[PDB]
Amino acid sequence: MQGKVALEEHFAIPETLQDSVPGDYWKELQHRLLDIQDTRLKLMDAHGIETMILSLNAPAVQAIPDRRKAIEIARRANDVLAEECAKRPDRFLAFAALPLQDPDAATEELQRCVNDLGFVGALVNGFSQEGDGQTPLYYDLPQYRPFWGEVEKLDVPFYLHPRNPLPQDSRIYDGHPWLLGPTWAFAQETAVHALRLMASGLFDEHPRLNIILGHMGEGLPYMMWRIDHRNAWVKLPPRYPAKRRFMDYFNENFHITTSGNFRTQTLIDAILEIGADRILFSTDWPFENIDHASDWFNATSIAEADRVKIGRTNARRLFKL
Amino acid sequence: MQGKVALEEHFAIPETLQDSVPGDYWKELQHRLLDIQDTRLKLMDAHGIETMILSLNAPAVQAIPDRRKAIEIARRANDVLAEECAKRPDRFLAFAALPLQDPDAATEELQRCVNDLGFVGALVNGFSQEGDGQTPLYYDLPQYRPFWGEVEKLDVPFYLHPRNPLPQDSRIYDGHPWLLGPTWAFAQETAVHALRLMASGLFDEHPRLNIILGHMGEGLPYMMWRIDHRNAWVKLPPRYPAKRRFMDYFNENFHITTSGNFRTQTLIDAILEIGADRILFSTDWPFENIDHASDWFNATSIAEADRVKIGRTNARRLFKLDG
Amino acid sequence: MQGKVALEEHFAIPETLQDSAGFVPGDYWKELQHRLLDIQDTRLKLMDAHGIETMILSLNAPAVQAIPDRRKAIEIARRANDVLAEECAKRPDRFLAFAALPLQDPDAATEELQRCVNDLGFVGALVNGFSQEGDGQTPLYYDLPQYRPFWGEVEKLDVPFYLHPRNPLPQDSRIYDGHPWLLGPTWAFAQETAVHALRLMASGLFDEHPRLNIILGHMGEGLPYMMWRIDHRNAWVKLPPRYPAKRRFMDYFNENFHITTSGNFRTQTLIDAILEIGADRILFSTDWPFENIDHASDWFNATSIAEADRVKIGRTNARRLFKL
Amino acid sequence: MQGKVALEEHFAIPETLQDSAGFVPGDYWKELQHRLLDIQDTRLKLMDAHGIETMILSLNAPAVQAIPDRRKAIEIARRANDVLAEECAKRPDRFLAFAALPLQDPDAATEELQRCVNDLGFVGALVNGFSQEGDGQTPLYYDLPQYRPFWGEVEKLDVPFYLHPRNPLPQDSRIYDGHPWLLGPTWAFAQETAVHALRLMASGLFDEHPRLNIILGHMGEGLPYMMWRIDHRNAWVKLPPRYPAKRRFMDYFNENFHITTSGNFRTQTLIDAILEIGADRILFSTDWPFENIDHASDWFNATSIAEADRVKIGRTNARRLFKLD
Ligand SMILES: O=Cc1cccc(O)c1O
Numbered sequence A: 001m002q003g004k005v006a007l008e009e010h011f012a013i014p015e016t017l018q019d020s021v022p023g024d025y026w027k028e029l030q031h032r033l034l035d036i037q038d039t040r041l042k043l044m045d046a047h048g049i050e051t052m053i054l055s056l057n058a059p060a061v062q063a064i065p066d067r068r069k070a071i072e073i074a075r076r077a078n079d080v081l082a083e084e085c086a087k088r089p090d091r092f093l094a095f096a097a098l099p100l101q102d103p104d105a106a107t108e109e110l111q112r113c114v115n116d117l118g119f120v121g122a123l124v125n126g127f128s129q130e131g132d133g134q135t136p137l138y139y140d141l142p143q144y145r146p147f148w149g150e151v152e153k154l155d156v157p158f159y160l161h162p163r164n165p166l167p168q169d170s171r172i173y174d175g176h177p178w179l180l181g182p183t184w185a186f187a188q189e190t191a192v193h194a195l196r197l198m199a200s201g202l203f204d205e206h207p208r209l210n211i212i213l214g215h216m217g218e219g220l221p222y223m224m225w226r227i228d229h230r231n232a233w234v235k236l237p238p239r240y241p242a243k244r245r246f247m248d249y250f251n252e253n254f255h256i257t258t259s260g261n262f263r264t265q266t267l268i269d270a271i272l273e274i275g276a277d278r279i280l281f282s283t284d285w286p287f288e289n290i291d292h293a294s295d296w297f298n299a300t301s302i303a304e305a306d307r308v309k310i311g312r313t314n315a316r317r318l319f320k321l
Numbered sequence B: 001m002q003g004k005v006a007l008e009e010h011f012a013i014p015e016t017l018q019d020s021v022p023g024d025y026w027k028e029l030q031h032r033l034l035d036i037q038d039t040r041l042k043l044m045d046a047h048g049i050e051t052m053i054l055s056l057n058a059p060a061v062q063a064i065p066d067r068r069k070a071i072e073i074a075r076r077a078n079d080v081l082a083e084e085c086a087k088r089p090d091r092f093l094a095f096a097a098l099p100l101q102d103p104d105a106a107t108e109e110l111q112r113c114v115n116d117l118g119f120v121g122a123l124v125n126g127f128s129q130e131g132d133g134q135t136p137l138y139y140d141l142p143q144y145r146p147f148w149g150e151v152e153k154l155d156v157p158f159y160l161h162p163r164n165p166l167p168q169d170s171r172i173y174d175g176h177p178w179l180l181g182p183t184w185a186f187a188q189e190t191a192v193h194a195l196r197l198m199a200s201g202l203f204d205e206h207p208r209l210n211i212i213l214g215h216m217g218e219g220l221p222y223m224m225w226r227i228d229h230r231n232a233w234v235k236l237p238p239r240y241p242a243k244r245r246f247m248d249y250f251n252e253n254f255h256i257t258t259s260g261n262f263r264t265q266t267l268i269d270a271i272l273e274i275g276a277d278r279i280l281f282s283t284d285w286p287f288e289n290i291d292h293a294s295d296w297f298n299a300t301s302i303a304e305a306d307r308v309k310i311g312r313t314n315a316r317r318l319f320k321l322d323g
Numbered sequence C: 001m002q003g004k005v006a007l008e009e010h011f012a013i014p015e016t017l018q019d020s021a022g023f024v025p026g027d028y029w030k031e032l033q034h035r036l037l038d039i040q041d042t043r044l045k046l047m048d049a050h051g052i053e054t055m056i057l058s059l060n061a062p063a064v065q066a067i068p069d070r071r072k073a074i075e076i077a078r079r080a081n082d083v084l085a086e087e088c089a090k091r092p093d094r095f096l097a098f099a100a101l102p103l104q105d106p107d108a109a110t111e112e113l114q115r116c117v118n119d120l121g122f123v124g125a126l127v128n129g130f131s132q133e134g135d136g137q138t139p140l141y142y143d144l145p146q147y148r149p150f151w152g153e154v155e156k157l158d159v160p161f162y163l164h165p166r167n168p169l170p171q172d173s174r175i176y177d178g179h180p181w182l183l184g185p186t187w188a189f190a191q192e193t194a195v196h197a198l199r200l201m202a203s204g205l206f207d208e209h210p211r212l213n214i215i216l217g218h219m220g221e222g223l224p225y226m227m228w229r230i231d232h233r234n235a236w237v238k239l240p241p242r243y244p245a246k247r248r249f250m251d252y253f254n255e256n257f258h259i260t261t262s263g264n265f266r267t268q269t270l271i272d273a274i275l276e277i278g279a280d281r282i283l284f285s286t287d288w289p290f291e292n293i294d295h296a297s298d299w300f301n302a303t304s305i306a307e308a309d310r311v312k313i314g315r316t317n318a319r320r321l322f323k324l
Numbered sequence D: 001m002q003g004k005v006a007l008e009e010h011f012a013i014p015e016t017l018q019d020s021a022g023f024v025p026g027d028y029w030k031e032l033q034h035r036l037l038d039i040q041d042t043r044l045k046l047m048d049a050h051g052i053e054t055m056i057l058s059l060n061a062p063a064v065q066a067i068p069d070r071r072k073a074i075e076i077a078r079r080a081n082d083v084l085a086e087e088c089a090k091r092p093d094r095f096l097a098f099a100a101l102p103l104q105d106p107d108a109a110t111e112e113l114q115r116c117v118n119d120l121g122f123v124g125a126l127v128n129g130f131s132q133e134g135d136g137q138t139p140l141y142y143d144l145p146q147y148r149p150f151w152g153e154v155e156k157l158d159v160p161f162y163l164h165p166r167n168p169l170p171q172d173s174r175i176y177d178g179h180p181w182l183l184g185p186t187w188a189f190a191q192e193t194a195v196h197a198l199r200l201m202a203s204g205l206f207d208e209h210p211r212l213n214i215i216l217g218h219m220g221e222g223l224p225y226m227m228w229r230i231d232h233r234n235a236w237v238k239l240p241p242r243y244p245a246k247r248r249f250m251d252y253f254n255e256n257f258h259i260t261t262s263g264n265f266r267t268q269t270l271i272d273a274i275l276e277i278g279a280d281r282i283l284f285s286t287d288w289p290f291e292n293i294d295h296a297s298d299w300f301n302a303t304s305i306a307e308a309d310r311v312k313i314g315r316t317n318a319r320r321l322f323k324l325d
């Protein structure tokens, strides 16, 4: 398939490069993160990707406790991104990096990126760290409501990307560093953060919000029925502040991408749960090979009509292209 | 479908009853947990369930930090269960409750239950608490290897059931108590515990072990490909003790049940990932209605041959009920 | 689900009533007759009880396609269409109509379609397979040259054509000899309709008139499950197909066809279709009065698909297709 | 996957070679002929390169079923079976055989089946649909009374019967008039075979001989997708069906049939079949030489199913069905 849109495609600036085993692989990953116009573009040309919506790596800004420095790095990463996109505006779009450890500063930067730089959304790596940085700050908290109000006003999607939990909140993984990151920790951290947003009632207040999750929803589709329907015989209204069910917000305010989850069975389950209209192609480059993602997607077992939607038209619609 | 086997069916004793919002619902749940020969049996007769493998509620024994006490409560719960099964051996089988905060004591109690009481397996509610009870004790730790060797020797399945994480390990849920329990916390806690067992190399050392997970695998099937294949371009070997991939152990040493997850889409995904031969019917009664579980399973969109396997023969084979 | 649209919903006029007699046991004939003649009473109450807002009505089968005499065929078609228009007018907020066509006379059929669409406001046509004409011993398929002008008009008017089943003629039914239970909805209906559809595709009809919209009931008469094989059998042979059409069967099926759930309330079948043609091209339908409305609705309300797709298949796909 | 078993793999003898001429363009005819006559060379090299350990061979189509003279049919069937036995003997660790049968003569077919199984060690029979006999203008279906003794012997021998396709006779093909491209594997093969299978079911054959094992290629010739409708159409009519069989079509399909992946390398189709008949009754097959072995193997090795089912469908279901363990 040609003319695809990919939207979980990362890059890094020297300041965040360290955020992502010594050897040829680490050297190659560093090159990939810093490259935009060469290797990356050539692969897009060879693997039917017309549009790549770029985003800074992780955890990046979300792991900078000093709001002062966080604001600076975010602004820097965004200006570099804007400069890179301007080189091939017909191929590159951008997601803004935000210093959410400072609500007002984050709101201001999002406005600058969207209104002045033409960015089409924001991508944030989970909870923020601030001050001593020993407390995970989730976005369902009261201090972030004004920010969400602005996101809805600008009417641009918010990509909730993964990050690892803090050491003090990772005891279940002690002795098993191999379970951290994309293996599992990433999904749990992001899925729960997403559920917190839903349970908080954020989407009752701002129903036009569009949240995007990668890695096919971080496991949510498979367990969505249970999330709401567990212990169904108990006919008492849910305790959380949200007015409706988790499935309602997931089906109405979320979209998921195929980033780093090139599995047909998983895609079929998602198609039968959230629907093909809310699934988007993405790769997670440079952490995943573009050819791996594209070759899988080009042949996965779905209707050609849905391959066109998931690979291109869903995204073009969502981002008003 | 008639002749079904269900194996995540709970009961409680006064001592553990509390582990399980005042009103008519709480009163009903208590009655259900304490009943075995009446209401429960009537529902089994009305909803085609021939065999019910019973197990104590949660967290129960796993939440008793004092070794001696945990050993006492487990032994008591097992003796009670043994007596209840003896009244209708043609309908009730039993899973052992184990005081794993004391490895040696747990091994002996399992032997006692299997060899002297005829129990067909063990059901444990995740990690154990011991001493000050501030440290979650996972079963991939070295001190539990002798235990697993015995489980394999006795050749009976181990049902790894959920429990909530300790408060100090649940900050991600702070302010959202509704996310604890069956809504989500139960699955995360159990899925990871399962992965720890796998990564530890436990199944290389004891390949004949049979582990059972409820709630359709606690989310594992959907993300299994990613667990091993994420960042595939990096051809460097994983550094965990296990010699093979997570999918190998999941596919060869695990079985999942339909407890509290009556969703056809989820079942189809599981069938295309682990296969119908490793999926078992279960309800999670009394936390789930038996009619809800049975009505869903009787009509879910699978081959009739697989409805028979998942509903009955897979379990008959696993627990050696045909000889 | 409420507000559903159903489009394989039949009725009969006295002149075609008997065509449905040999499709149900004699003990159920009285009831089936009542159902076929009733449009404003029981039918509407069932629609209200089972969340059906719009019902696109069509004459029963084989009806007009089984009338060998052209003059007579044209007569019955016009009468059936006039009656349908009269019934729809009594409850225009709930009923729409498909035209019955005397295709044993191409020119007459083209004229009748124009009248139904332009003057009566019909939203499409429903035809029960091949036509019989003259001695009526030869099945007339619509991929034949004489029907090209007709198809050009269908595309111009831009209304869908529902290719409904009918049984093959006796001389073309030997494979079912001794097995009358295989005729009709059990199997014969599907084979007859699936092949007719393939004939249209292979003929190049859609190369000439790419904007045509054809609708098939019973989840595509079996086509989705075998579509890959239809084009890809003997793939090692790198040579172009031998038929007139310029592209593959899957291209025309994916671009010019839509399928309905009429008389095929099977979740597995729906999942396969979703993974082959996509939810955007599947429409809810019941096949009432030959199928119970509650059977169709209860199954569809709970089938294992995304709620977003339940809304599309149950309502919005049809509202988009018929420009409602 | 290595160690696969494939069971819709054809060959031909000079006497039946021309039967396959009309199913491939003139340019590919030379190649198809080579493939059909080859068993020990090219075929084996492809099996070694594409993980196929066992290939159960069968004569091409329509072959014997299109020979109306009983005597000639018996002669050709016997000759084809002797050649096949000779070929299998050259490499018995890789090749097994399905018997060709002269069913235009029930008694002769029964005797030849006995000879193939008891003396030649054949593991079943493969028949290309209905038989023609005498004037050859009437399709002879196996649900007819004269074939009951034969079926009884098939059950006694306890070997599977592969009901393979063939095209209908011209007078029974008017729906395809002007569309020769719809005959054969494109569609006609499936319709012809699906209905023949339904006739067997409806006849009550499986009530009388419940241990029979019938095999269909091309993923069931379309049956799985429409099976619900076959039994449940017009469900509101609460009256038993009119056919002689005591149960439902789905019952016989689920209990007496197995389907193969021959010439139908489509994941969506396989998923539907898994959710209808179950993985325990689906078998890998290629339809070589009409289909490329690598096409079948490459697709099957990567299709979206559980690895446990890939092993069953690719090898163990067949080994269990043909008692190879
Ligand atoms: O965004 C993906 C990603 C980020 C950091 C590390 C890693 O392994 C990843 O796959």
Ligand SMILES: O=Cc1cccc(O)c1O
Residues within 6 Å of the ligand: A231, B010, B020, B058, B181, B182, B284, B287
């Ligand atoms: O075992 C299931 C279970 C246990 C404790 C509480 C609960 O809600 C449950 O569903």
Ligand SMILES: O=Cc1cccc(O)c1O
Residues within 6 Å of the ligand: C010, C020, C023, C061, C184, C185, C263, C287, C290, C291, D234
């Ligand atoms: O249109 C459907 C239909 C028509 C005639 C007969 C029958 O059984 C049917 O299901």
Ligand SMILES: O=Cc1cccc(O)c1O
Residues within 6 Å of the ligand: C234, D010, D020, D023, D061, D184, D185, D263, D287, D290
């Ligand atoms: O068996 C398959 C087959 C036989 C004859 C002809 C053909 O095209 C085929 O695909």
Ligand SMILES: [Zn+2]
Residues within 6 Å of the ligand: A008, A010, A161, A214, A259, A284
């Ligand atoms: Zn990423």
Ligand SMILES: [Zn+2]
Residues within 6 Å of the ligand: B008, B010, B161, B214, B259, B284
């Ligand atoms: Zn439980």
Ligand SMILES: [Zn+2]
Residues within 6 Å of the ligand: C008, C010, C164, C217, C262, C287
């Ligand atoms: Zn109809």
Ligand SMILES: [Zn+2]
Residues within 6 Å of the ligand: D008, D010, D164, D217, D262, D287
């Ligand atoms: Zn063949």
